[PDB]
A paper describes a structure:
We report here the immunogenicity in rhesus macaques and CH103 CD4-binding site bnAb UCA KI mice of sequential Env immunogens derived from the CH505 HIV-1-infected individual who made the CH103 bnAb lineage. In macaques, vaccine-induced nAbs  had epitopes overlapping that of CH103, bound only open trimers, and neutralized rare tier 2 viruses. The antibody clonal lineage most similar to CH103 we identified was an IGHV4-J, CH505 differential-binding clonal lineage (DH522) with autologous tier 1, and heterologous tier 1 and weak tier 2 neutralization activities derived from memory B cells of RM-5556 immunized with additive CH505 Envs. DH522 lineage mAbs did not neutralize tier 2 CH505 TF, neutralized 7% of a panel of 199 HIV-1 primary isolates, and blocked the binding of CH103 lineage Ab (CH106) to CH505 TF gp120.
For comparison, we found that the DH522 lineage antibodies bound natively glycosylated and glycan-deleted CH505 TF gp120 Envs equally well, but did not neutralize HIV-1 pseudoviruses bearing these Envs nor bound free N-glycans.
Residue numbers in the entry:
A (entry chain H): 2 to 35, 35A, 36 to 52, 52A, 53 to 82, 82A, 82B, 82C, ...
B (entry chain L): 2 to 6, 8 to 27, 27A, 27B, 27C, 28 to 95, 95A, 96 to 106, ...
Write the structure that this text describes.
Amino acid sequence: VQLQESGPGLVKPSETLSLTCAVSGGSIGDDYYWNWIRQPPGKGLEWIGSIYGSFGGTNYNPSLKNRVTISMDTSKNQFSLKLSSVTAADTAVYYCARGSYNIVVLFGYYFDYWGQGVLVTVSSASTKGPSVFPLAPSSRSTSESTAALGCLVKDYFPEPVTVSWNSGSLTSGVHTFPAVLQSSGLYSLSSVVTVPSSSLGTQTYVCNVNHKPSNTKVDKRVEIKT
Amino acid sequence: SALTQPPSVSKSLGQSVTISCSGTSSDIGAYNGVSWYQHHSGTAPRLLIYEVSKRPSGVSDRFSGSKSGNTASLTISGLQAEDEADYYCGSYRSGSTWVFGGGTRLTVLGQPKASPTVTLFPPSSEELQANKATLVCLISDFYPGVVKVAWKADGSAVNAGVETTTPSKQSNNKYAASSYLSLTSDQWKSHKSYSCQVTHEGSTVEKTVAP
């Protein structure tokens, strides 16, 4: 059973946030509660609302019910969220989640299976795709017979960017560092990987930079300085 | 809020902690339905406890839960570094809604001191063509999670152009952080050397790059 959030990471203030949760590994019309829960930065978890699989009845967080509609489509096997008149305080990670129950009036229900979370940022500022530049291998800070190399992922907005290496077939010694935020309003981060010095020249190294908020992907080849 | 937890708790390695969760008679005291959740930065909340004291398969023995009246409690024994996280209680509430606690941030004290490895990269040729230069200073494998970074240019202090991130935990329970020096290609080429200096627990590592 798996849950997967999708939707725009960017939404203008006053406008309506729309997210969908695609449910796999189990039907969505079974005996379950389907939930939206968010976490604004620094704030804690907050239940948004739920819809009941078998009958479609909804319930909402009292202080959000006038702004929220939760829907479900039994074909497509999805449920979804719409949040109206959004403001900066709705900037949050949104999770979908399954609520498993026994007898609600005795034990309530709980959240066993969760999505991974999608960040949504409320902001008038426009989308900005990253510029990617190589970090040329250097051996001085790693162990003997190895070197570290990576990619600077520069000037994007909003979060997040994800980096993988050689299309996910290189996962050993990978470290992607948390983003930094400039006064410009843009983010940057670096991803590095530690590899054998002997393989430089032989093995090609490529960082797969993924920036879904701008629908941009960059596969950057990392070379030695000529 | 709406269910009340301590903002943070700090205990030493091996010790045991208790996280409390004060709610009401329409929640915790109305049902056998308080759940607990572990939330590591970057991944989704993980169910630790459901129906007050039940553990799902895969949750360790060291985690237990109970309740007395309107207050629920989560107990972790044999605290390890990995246990550092934000912990939430939550419950069904009469009227068919659901409410979370505010969350407790657990720190586990007493971990071994680790000095940072420092990796400094020069700007790429490609970026220099565009008349800008970003020096990338990556700081890793340090504990505790606090460093001070300083940048020099031919031995002279730099204050403008610099942005440093808040330390964040790696899988191995040590800390990582990065610092960025944003220059123009003119600046970069006009100095003989740039330096990244990381001070941790009274000790300093310095890496240098050159055009």
